[PDB]
From a paper:
TRPV5 is a calcium selective ion channel that is responsible for the fine tuning of calcium reabsorption in the kidney and has been shown to be a critical component of systemic calcium homeostasis. In the cell, binding of PI(4,5)P2 is critical for channel opening while rapid desensitization occurs via binding of calmodulin (CaM) to the base of the pore. The transmembrane domain (TMD) consists of transmembrane helices 1–4 (S1-S4) bundled in a voltage sensing-like domain with helices 5 and 6 (S5 and S6) domain swapped to create the pore of the channel. The intracellular portion of the protein is primarily composed of tightly packed ankyrin repeat domains (ARDs).
The fifth derivative, ZINC17988990, was found to be a potent inhibitor of TRPV5 mediated currents. This compound exhibited robust inhibition of rbTRPV5 with an IC50 of 106 ± 27 nM while also showing marked selectivity for TRPV5 over TRPV6. In order to verify that the newly identified TRPV5 inhibitors, ZINC9155420 and ZINC17988990, bind to TRPV5, we utilized cryo-electron microscopy (cryo-EM) to solve the structure of rabbit TRPV5 in the presence of each compound. We were able to resolve nanodisc-reconstituted TRPV5 in the presence of 10 µM ZINC9155420 or ZINC17988990 to 4.3 Å and 3.8 Å, respectively. At these resolutions, we were able to clearly identify that the ion conduction pathway for both inhibitor-bound structures are in non-conducting conformations. The ZINC17988990-bound TRPV5 structure revealed two densities that could be attributed to bound compounds. One density identified in the ZINC17988990-bound TRPV5 structure is located between the intracellular S1-S4 bundle and the TRP helix and it is present in the sharpened map as well as both of the half-maps. Though the upper region of the S1-S4 pocket has been consistently occupied by lipids in the previous TRPV5 channel structures, a density lower in the pocket has been identified for the first time in the ZINC17988990-bound structure. In the case of TRPV6, this was proposed in spite of lipid binding reported in the same area in previous structures. This precedent, along with the absence of the lower density in previously published TRPV5 cryo-EM structures, has led us to attribute this density to bound ZINC17988990. The residues that constitute this binding site in the S1-S4 bundle of the ZINC17988990-bound TRPV5 structure include E403, D406, Y415, Y467 and F468. The substantially reduced inhibitory effects of these S1-S4 bundle mutant channels indicate that this compound exerts its inhibitory effect primarily by binding in this pocket. Specifically, the S2 and S3 helices of the ZINC17988990-bound TRPV5 have moved toward the ZINC17988990 density, which creates a tighter space with in the intracellular section of the S1-S4 bundle compared to the lipid-bound apo TRPV5 structure.
Author numbering:
A (entry chain C), B (entry chain A): 29 to 223, 230 to 638
The structure:
């Protein structure tokens, strides 16, 4: 997996060190190769550890004289690849075009070497363990490393300008998946100058190279790729009216659109590629004229439905408990009424109407949530903050708990408060999803969703051991006293709860001077103060101050991505008699079935 | 000590000012030296204050003509050193090679001056009072100041290329203990080119120069010294596979390893030398594959043992107190049971099993802690944060208090809560030691251990005088009233405790409107509010905010050092049938008994 790589590389190097002809080809001798070529009894096709040919070990250490003498001694060593596991289809041409010497590649092409030999192992394969991905073909190798006089020398010998390899990619996808981009823009331009030919082709995953430029986030290759579609109109003064093309920027023929494909990626450039001009102007116009006046009425309808659920939950049926309460610590003066007395009057008919509209809202929420999560994977939909993981989780939780409340009401079971309080508090804390489209409540809900999983997760794992270590001491100091004067510290769970409440200072310190408290309680409380309340509760404020100072641009760079996410979701969901196209047409203007855009510009 | 240096330097300068021949040699006269050399009655071997020879005072003020005329007048003044206290074995050759003139050194070597004269005083000695440490030999002087044409001129006269001096050092250790390093890398390279010869030699303390490079933290000399062992394998494309050597980086033959020697230093570069490549890759692999799956089960076993101790401490034997409580301020309804009624049932047998496993855990903690602190000094083990001083202190305290609890239980003494509460709260606050290997709770426990000794130590020395000055005023205002309406402010210790509680606002302000409080209490409380609660308690938050802003990189530069500390500690502690080696072997690959490492790299 990892140590197997060292296990095979040491074996290859040990075989190279042991074999004398390969050692001479490594050291670049002349008389030793001359005597081993003159003595014809020695074998020249001998293999090392991992398919190691003498031409391979010459080209790996760049021995031009040894390679030329080897091909003029026996030229039948270029068309034979390796056969072992990490380097399956490697060739001398492959390692020569990676090592970037023109003369050895010219000598190999003069000595009859094929240019369509494929390499399918663990070396040249898209995986996070290998450092580089160059492709599985010599033209992909040359155009990916960025040479200039090897690409013509290979294409004029017919080396598959439109090639295919593992995972269905091609040379344009390989040039897009690169971190240099400045000596790769010219290479992509030259290969597009050489040749549904090569741009509109999909891979095995279904990624046209424009959508791969999207999902990988290379903004400079995107900004060059836009300039092979940009129609330019007139210019006068300092202003110019460029006319872009959006027939790839929004799909409308396939459900998988470019914008839906780029708003739900997992990298750190899918929210920076949404700042270039012909996608920013488009989603700004479409958002400001089509996303606010439906999100506002959706938020109003959700808040109206939740106030119906809150009032229907308040007006709950209750009957007086006839069994007595002969216990000094028992209080229950109302009891949950039986189901057979739930239809008695007009008020109970109104409560029935409220229960019906609550159950209808719960089932339409569940049926509007489930078939969208069956398509996108659960990780991409529950994880990210651009899409709404920690709101869809509590929405599905609210729907399942309201359904369990309705079933528990119909089966005539006691204890309705146990799911009712949870369903109500989650359904009212889930209104925060409708605080995406407003720039006031925009970055603040991102800050609180970041602050919970960033600092409260770090802080409660060190609050739990302090309250769990101090509640036991408070209980041991107060298990030899009376529970008449000090109500707290009687049993262990109320001791734990009261120690946590004294930790957050929401309750007062226990004090009663009708008795005399023990010295051990007094000294451990005077230590508990300046260990757990003066220090740690005032260090939390400084830590969430510095997180707020340092993450003061991720919220402003993530809010635009989540508002484009809501625009794309509503454009896919709501019907298309109410969601028309974007941009001008081209059928009534002498162009034909290509929707355009016309963004006015101003420089100087 | 310090003023003695001024006392001897003024005496030397006064003797130079008083003696006429030395004054002429200072002023660089010609006719005065000519007449004092022609008049042969004058003595030339006369000594000043601290062994002051005329050749010494010529070479100290760089008088080439005076020195040449002195050696051509009487050449018997070069082989005689000084004899007084601060400058014992100083020579004209020593001060000439420090003053860096080639001609005077050539003249002294032509006039028969020895090159192995040693200087052992208070001047040339490793101590924090002297500014520089250059060594105790002329070759150490030349190679430490960094000359180029003096080192060959001295070594070709046989001036001890492999020398020894005080504290057992040599010239490579002297070149390592230097703050220049850029004109010292070439000097170290030239001396290693000139010559178990010189690299594998130890000093008197037991420091091979590689381990001295470690313990002194000079990263550039470390990064050059690594490149005399780095074996290079093939290269192709932009990636290269260097093959380092770890036979010095981890010892395995001596208990004192390089990594244990470098993780427990007291400087500010022992945590920066742990970022270079062939130690970072090694400890990253060894930590992620061998330190987490034993630290996790160690934390689980410690938390399980502490929950056994907490439950065994809760289930404590108690007998009802038969003596009466005829006192309006006495509450004791349960009394500690006698030892003879501690084995009565199955529950008391279970409590006995809990006491036995608690005492066994305490004695294995103490026997696992003590023989490790007997070897490393108490300062290095209790002080630093990389090693765990403020956790080993509270662990030894918990073990001694649990042993004192067991002895106090067997001797049938009352008052078990007095050590039991302390032992329980320290044993539960000591779980924080197992928050080193997790990157969530990593920097936060460093922040709280820094915040206590950095700000709470500064703050409680100015909280103590405010509460000690306000509790007395609150007592004087309320010693002429009734303790029936106001429970607080009755005697002085409860007045002090209630003033501290009102300082931290955990208790409410005393108010009772069934009576009339004095005007003096009212005005001093209205001053106590906006002097001690609005201001100082809200300045503490700002101070621990700015400490958190400024020490936001020492925690991220110290956490890696303490996780390498725990890796080295577990590698030394746990047995070696479960802790195997690191890196590949070299016996089955044609190298022989040298464990290697193979780190893959990528540039361009
Ligand atoms: O209308 C919806 C949302 C469901 N709901 C309602 O009905 C009523 O009010 C709500 C209030 C709070 C929470 C949910 C609702 O459908 C599901 C849905 N929400 C989203 S948000 C971003 C995306 C997205 C877009 C493109 C790619 C990937 C993800 C997304 C999605 O794909 N589906
Ligand atoms: O609880 C804890 C620590 C324990 N731990 C949980 O409990 C939930 O699974 C976990 C998964 C991994 C690690 C720890 C835990 O402390 C921090 C903390 N993180 C969160 S995330 C959501 C909540 C939450 C808020 C209100 C009600 C219910 C849950 C939450 C929380 O209350 N605390
Ligand atoms: O296993 C140990 C630690 C002792 N303990 C346990 O047994 C049980 O759980 C514990 C929980 C909290 C505290 C202690 C324990 O031994 C002692 C020990 N701890 C350390 S931490 C770093 C070093 C170190 C490494 C290299 C050089 C210098 C110091 C170190 C050490 O040398 N000894
Ligand atoms: O106490 C003080 C000041 C008095 N002073 C001690 O008392 C301990 O020796 C000292 C040594 C030098 C200077 C002052 C003191 O204020 C600050 C302060 N520093 C610390 S360090 C550990 C604790 C601690 C925490 C909980 C229980 C027991 C001790 C601590 C503390 O409570 N306060």
């Amino acid at each position: 997996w990892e140590q197997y790589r060292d296990r095979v590389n040491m074996l290859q190097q040990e075989r190279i060190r042991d074999s004398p002809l390969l050692q001479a080809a490594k050291e670049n001798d002349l008389r030793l190769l001359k005597i081993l070529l003159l003595n014809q009894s020695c074998d020249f096709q001998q293999r090392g550890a991992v398919g190691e040919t003498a031409l391979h070990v010459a080209a790996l250490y760049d021995n031009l004289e040894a390679a030329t003498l080897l091909m003029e001694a026996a030229p039948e060593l270029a068309k034979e690849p390796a056969l072992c596991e990490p380097f399956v289809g490697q060739t001398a041409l492959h390692i020569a075009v990676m090592n970037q010497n023109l003369n050895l590649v010219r000598a190999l092409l003069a000595r009859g070497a094929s240019v369509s030999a494929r390499a399918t192992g663990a070396a040249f394969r898209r995986s996070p363990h290998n450092l580089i991905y160059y492709g599985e073909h010599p033209l992909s190798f040359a155009a990916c490393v960025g040479s200039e006089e090897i690409v013509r020398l290979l294409i004029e010998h017919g080396a598959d300008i439109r090639a295919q390899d593992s995972l269905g990619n091609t040379v344009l996808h390989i040039l897009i998946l690169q971190p240099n981009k400045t000596f790769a823009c010219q290479m992509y331009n030259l290969l597009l100058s050489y040749d549904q030919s090569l741009e509109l082709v999909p891979n095995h995953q279904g990624l046209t190279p424009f959508k791969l430029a999207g999902v990988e986030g290379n903004t400079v290759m995107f900004q060059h790729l836009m300039q092979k579609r940009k129609h330019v109109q007139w210019t006068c003064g300092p202003l110019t009216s460029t006319l872009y093309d959006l027939t790839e920027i929004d799909s409308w023929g396939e459900e998988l659109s470019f914008l839906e494909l780029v708003v739900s990626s997992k990298k750190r450039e899918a929210r920076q590629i949404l700042e270039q001009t012909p996608v920013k102007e488009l989603v700004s116009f479409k958002w400001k004229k089509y996303g606010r006046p439906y999100f506002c009425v959706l938020a109003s309808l959700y808040i109206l439905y939740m106030i119906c659920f809150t009032t229907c939950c308040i007006y709950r049926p209750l009957k007086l408990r006839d069994d007595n309460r002969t216990d000094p610590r028992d209080i229950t003066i109302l009891q949950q009424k039986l189901l057979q007395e739930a239809y008695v009057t007009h008020q109970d008919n109104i409560r029935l109407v409220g229960e019906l509209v609550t159950v209808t809202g719960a089932v339409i929420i569940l049926l509007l949530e489930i078939p969208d999560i069956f398509r996108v994977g659960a990780s991409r939909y529950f994880g990210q903050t651009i899409l709404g993981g920690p709101f869809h989780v509590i929405i599905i939780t609210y729907a399942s708990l309201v359904l369990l409340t309705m079933v528990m009401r119909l089966t005539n079971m006691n204890g309705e408060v146990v799911p009712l309080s949870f369903a109500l508090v989650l359904g009212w804390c889930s209104v925060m999803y409708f605080a995406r489209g407003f720039q006031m409540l925009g970055p603040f809900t991102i800050m609180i969703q970041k602050m919970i999983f960033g600092d409260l997760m770090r802080f409660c794992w060190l609050m739990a051991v302090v309250i769990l270590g101090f509640a036991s001491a408070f209980h041991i100091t107060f298990q030899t006293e009376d529970p008449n004067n000090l109500g707290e510290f009687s049993d262990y769970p109320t001791a734990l709860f009261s120690t946590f409440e004294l930790f957050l200072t929401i309750i007062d310190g226990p004090a009663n001077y009708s008795v005399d408290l023990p010295f051990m309680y007094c000294i451990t409380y005077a230590a508990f103060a300046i260990i757990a309340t003066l220090l740690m509760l005032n260090l939390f404020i400084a830590m969430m101050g510095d997180t707020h100072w340092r993450v003061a641009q991720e919220r402003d760079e993530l809010w635009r991505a989540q508002v484009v996410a809501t625009t794309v979701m509503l454009e896919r969901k709501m019907p298309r008699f109410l969601w028309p196209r974007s941009g001008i047409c081209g059928y009534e203007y002498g162009l034909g079935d290509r929707w355009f855009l016309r963004v006015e510009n101003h420089h100087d």
